[PDB]
């Protein structure tokens, strides 16, 4: 039932391709990219460039829930394989194991003893859990058939399967809904439109309205009416309306969340992890400075604020991918690791993910 | 293992950083002897060098010391990211920037300590595994502003600028190297510009009196830094600007990885 999202990161001579298609055919032979096991259904992500995996992490296109390292017991580890784990420690994957592929080719045991324990340092250097799965696997071998491999890419998959923790569901996260649109349903109140972002909310449950607006306002919702039926509780993804009790149409606005009372908080000044869309994406033309004011994004209406250069950086230039401090005019609803459009009139220009709340 | 142990590969693999099996293979080759062993795994990455050497190479970085300027490529940028890639570009820049070659084979041959730069380099791709190109090099006797540019913050500079210049206003002629960075100016001024690519582009414009005249104007206006508007003030151009800094540019050049 739940989906989750596995990196593969390697050399690419390792075998790095090579042992995804043989995880394939082993499962498809199983049970007659995306593939899956018993427990779960798994996604495939790459990292082929350090730089522009962070630009798709940024621009939520990329998320790892665990990642694969593929190191050919031929060889051992490389100079890179120190910068592959890098990576994985800098965007926070919570849990790695490793495919000793071409484990066919070393005929002497001590060899591949001695390449885990290569591999096993690495891991350790980078605070990942020393004794964690080390697998020998040939890719090569179990796409020919031969059982005793066929095997090890099966308990490869097994690793992956007890070793990499289930992820959290959006349901069970606190809730919050981005508001679209507000009217009133004459005699009945007023009432917030959006899609569910995260958690469950209940049809008498009290909720508080944050951002944009100086104050945040608590009040309790009175009927969630999807489609135009109303409904017990209203589930992370569903598109809804939440009828607010004695709340004004003039007193909300898109922009604001609807959230479980003290989980979010209105916030003003970051530090941000950005990407700038080049030219020839559709972006800005000319470079930015340091006292730059374009609107950003957040979840469903663009606030206005001004950029900071960190000390060290002159410029940034279209295609960049920097970090930056930004000063809104109005206070909006934000957390770490939230996602944010930078537009220019409502063009998207670039793309960030807050990293450290001020203020 | 027939001549020699285990620990005996360890160590071939920690001296010559090359690949457990590669070494273990390579003693058994001269069967236990050690010293023909390291010599013998030079003549595998000598050919493995080789085999990949029609692949393509758009990571890497640039570097600049004392108005050297020079582009080292790489297949991942993992690798341009990584200490042993780096210290290798550090090297051959301070190589350039002390023998001031005259052109790029020129700095290949330059000595980087106990070895060359193509051996230093040839080297240091068969540890790796990817192909390493030394892509460009630029050298300039004058005075000189230097800006280094990242694409993406945790990664070395991927744009490179040099201007040397005559002046006294520092800022003035860094502020330049910006504005060569940004908008990727070809030529320095109009009469630069070859008589065969004004053709070209006055041939374009006959296939879209005065309108071949206005686009020329326009793309002089875009790929010749004295002619662009200032990125700090576009109301006022590069040229003017110069003139109230009291700053000469006399050549520059501009690199940037992957790109032309
Ligand atoms: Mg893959
Ligand atoms: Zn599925
Ligand atoms: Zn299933
Ligand atoms: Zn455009
Ligand atoms: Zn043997
Ligand atoms: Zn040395
Ligand atoms: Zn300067």
Same mark, same amino acid.
């Given at each position: 039932?739940?989906?989750?999202?596995?990196g593969?990161?390697?050399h690419?001579?390792?075998?790095?391709?090579?042992?995804?298609?043989?995880?394939?055919?082993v499962l498809?032979?199983?049970?007659?990219?995306?593939?899956?096991?018993?427990?779960?259904?798994?996604?495939?992500?790459?990292a082929?460039?350090?730089?522009?995996?962070?630009?798709?992490?940024?621009?939520? +296109? +990329?998320?790892?829930?665990?990642?694969?390292?593929?190191?050919?017991?031929?060889?051992?580890?490389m100079?890179?394989?120190?910068?592959?784990?890098?990576l994985?420690?800098?965007?926070?994957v919570?849990?790695?194991?490793?495919?000793?592929? $071409?484990?066919?080719?070393?005929?002497?045991?001590?060899?591949? #003893?001695?390449? *885990?324990?290569?591999?096993?340092?690495?891991?350790?250097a980078?605070?990942?859990? #020393?004794?964690a799965?080390?697998?020998?696997?040939?890719?090569?071998?179990?796409?020919?058939?031969?059982? $005793?491999?066929?095997?090890?890419? #099966?308990?490869?998959?097994?690793?992956?399967?007890?070793?990499?923790?289930?992820?959290?569901?959006?349901?069970?996260?606190?809730?919050?809904?981005?508001?679209?649109?507000?009217?009133?349903?004459?005699?009945?109140?007023?009432?917030?439109?959006?899609?569910?972002?995260?958690?469950?909310?209940?049809?008498?449950?009290?909720?508080?309205?944050?951002?944009?607006?100086?104050? @945040?306002?608590?009040?309790?919702?009175?009927?969630? #009416?999807?489609?135009?039926?109303?409904?017990?509780?209203?589930? +992370?993804?569903?598109?809804?309306?939440?009828?607010?009790?004695?709340v004004?149409?003039?007193?909300?606005?898109?922009?604001?969340?609807?959230?479980?009372?003290?989980?979010?908080?209105?916030?003003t000044?970051?530090?941000?992890?950005?990407?700038?869309l080049?030219?020839?994406?559709?972006?800005?033309?000319?470079?930015?400075?340091?006292?730059?004011?374009?609107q950003?994004?957040?979840?469903?209406?663009?606030? @206005?604020?001004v950029?900071?250069?960190?000390?060290?950086?002159?410029?940034?230039?279209?295609?960049?991918?920097?970090?930056?401090?930004?000063?809104?005019?109005?206070?909006?609803?934000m957390? *770490?690791?939230?996602?944010?459009?930078i537009? *220019?009139?409502?063009?998207?220009?670039?793309?960030?993910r807050?990293?450290?709340?001020?203020? | 293992?027939?001549?020699?142990?285990?620990?005996?590969? %360890?160590?071939?693999?920690?001296?010559?950083?090359?690949?457990?099996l590669?070494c273990?293979?390579?003693?058994?080759?001269?069967?236990?002897?050690?010293?023909?062993?390291?010599?013998?795994?030079?003549?595998?990455?000598?050919k493995?060098?080789?085999?990949?050497?029609?692949?393509?190479?758009?990571?890497?970085?640039?570097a600049?010391?004392?108005?050297? !300027?020079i582009?080292?490529?790489?297949?991942?940028?993992?690798?341009?990211?990584?200490?042993?890639?780096?210290?290798?570009?550090?090297?051959v &820049?301070?190589?350039?920037?002390?023998?001031?070659?005259?052109?790029?084979?020129?700095?290949?041959?330059?000595?980087?300590?106990?070895?060359? &730069?193509?051996?230093?380099?040839?080297?240091?791709?068969?540890?790796?595994?990817?192909?390493?190109?030394?892509?460009?090099?630029?050298?300039?006797?004058?005075?000189?502003?230097? =800006?280094?540019?990242?694409?993406?913050?945790?990664?070395?500079?991927?744009?490179?600028? !040099?201007?040397? =210049?005559?002046?006294?206003?520092?800022?003035?002629?860094?502020?330049?190297?910006?504005?060569?960075?940004?908008?990727?100016?070809? =030529?320095?001024?109009?009469?630069?510009?070859?008589?065969?690519?004004?053709?070209?582009?006055?041939?374009?414009?006959?296939?879209?009196? %005065?309108?071949?005249?206005?686009?020329?104007?326009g793309?002089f206006?875009?790929?010749?830094?004295?002619?662009?508007?200032?990125?700090?003030?576009?109301?006022?151009?590069?040229?003017?600007?110069?003139?109230?800094?009291?700053?000469?540019?006399?050549?520059?050049?501009?690199?940037?990885?992957?790109?032309?």
């Amino acid at each position: 039932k739940p989906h989750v999202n596995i990196g593969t990161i390697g050399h690419v001579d390792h075998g790095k391709t090579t042992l995804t298609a043989a995880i394939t055919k082993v499962l498809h032979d199983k049970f007659p990219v995306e593939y899956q096991t018993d427990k779960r259904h798994y996604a495939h992500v790459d990292a082929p460039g350090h730089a522009d995996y962070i630009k798709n992490m940024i621009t939520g +296109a +990329a998320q790892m829930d665990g990642a694969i390292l593929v190191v050919a017991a031929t060889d051992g580890p490389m100079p890179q394989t120190r910068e592959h784990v890098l990576l994985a420690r800098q965007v926070g994957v919570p849990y790695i194991l490793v495919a000793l592929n $071409k484990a066919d080719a070393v005929d002497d045991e001590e060899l591949l #003893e001695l390449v *885990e324990m290569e591999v096993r340092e690495l891991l350790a250097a980078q605070e990942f859990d #020393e004794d964690a799965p080390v697998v020998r696997v040939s890719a090569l071998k179990a796409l020919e058939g031969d059982a $005793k491999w066929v095997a090890s890419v #099966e308990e490869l998959m097994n690793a992956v399967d007890e070793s990499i923790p289930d992820p959290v569901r959006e349901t069970d996260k606190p809730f919050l809904m981005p508001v679209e649109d507000v009217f009133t349903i004459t005699g009945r109140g007023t009432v917030v439109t959006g899609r569910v972002e995260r958690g469950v909310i209940n049809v008498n449950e009290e909720v508080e309205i944050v951002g944009i607006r100086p104050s @945040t306002t608590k009040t309790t919702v009175t009927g969630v #009416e999807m489609f135009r039926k109303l409904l017990d509780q209203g589930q +992370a993804g569903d598109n809804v309306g939440l009828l607010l009790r004695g709340v004004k149409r003039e007193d909300v606005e898109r922009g604001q969340v609807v959230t479980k009372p003290g989980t979010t908080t209105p916030h003003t000044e970051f530090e941000g992890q950005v990407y700038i869309l080049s030219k020839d994406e559709g972006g800005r033309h000319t470079p930015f400075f340091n006292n730059y004011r374009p609107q950003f994004y957040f979840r469903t209406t663009d606030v @206005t604020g001004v950029v900071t250069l960190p000390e060290g950086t002159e410029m940034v230039m279209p295609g960049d991918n920097t970090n930056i401090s930004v000063k809104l005019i109005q206070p909006v609803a934000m957390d *770490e690791g939230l996602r944010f459009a930078i537009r *220019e009139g409502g063009r998207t220009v670039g793309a960030g993910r807050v990293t450290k709340i001020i203020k | 293992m027939a001549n020699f142990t285990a620990a005996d590969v %360890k160590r071939l693999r920690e001296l010559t950083g090359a690949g457990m099996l590669a070494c273990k293979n390579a003693l058994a080759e001269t069967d236990g002897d050690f010293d023909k062993a390291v010599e013998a795994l030079r003549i595998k990455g000598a050919k493995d060098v080789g085999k990949r050497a029609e692949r393509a190479t758009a990571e890497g970085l640039v570097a600049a010391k004392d108005g050297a !300027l020079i582009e080292l490529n790489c297949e991942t940028d993992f690798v341009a990211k990584n200490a042993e890639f780096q210290t290798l570009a550090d090297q051959v &820049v301070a190589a350039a920037a002390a023998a001031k070659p005259a052109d790029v084979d020129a700095l290949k041959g330059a000595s980087i300590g106990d070895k060359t &730069v193509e051996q230093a380099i040839a080297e240091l791709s068969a540890k790796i595994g990817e192909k390493l190109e030394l892509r460009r090099v630029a050298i300039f006797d004058g005075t000189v502003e230097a =800006y280094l540019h990242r694409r993406s913050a945790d990664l070395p500079p991927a744009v490179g600028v !040099l201007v040397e =210049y005559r002046g006294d206003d520092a800022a003035a002629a860094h502020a330049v190297a910006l504005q060569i960075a940004a908008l990727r100016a070809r =030529y320095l001024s109009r009469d630069d510009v070859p008589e065969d690519i004004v053709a070209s582009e006055r041939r374009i414009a006959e296939e879209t009196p %005065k309108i071949v005249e206005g686009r020329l104007n326009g793309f002089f206006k875009d790929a010749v830094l004295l002619e662009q508007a200032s990125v700090s003030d576009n109301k006022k151009t590069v040229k003017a600007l110069l003139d109230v800094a009291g700053v000469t540019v006399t050549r520059f050049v501009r690199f940037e990885v992957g790109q032309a």
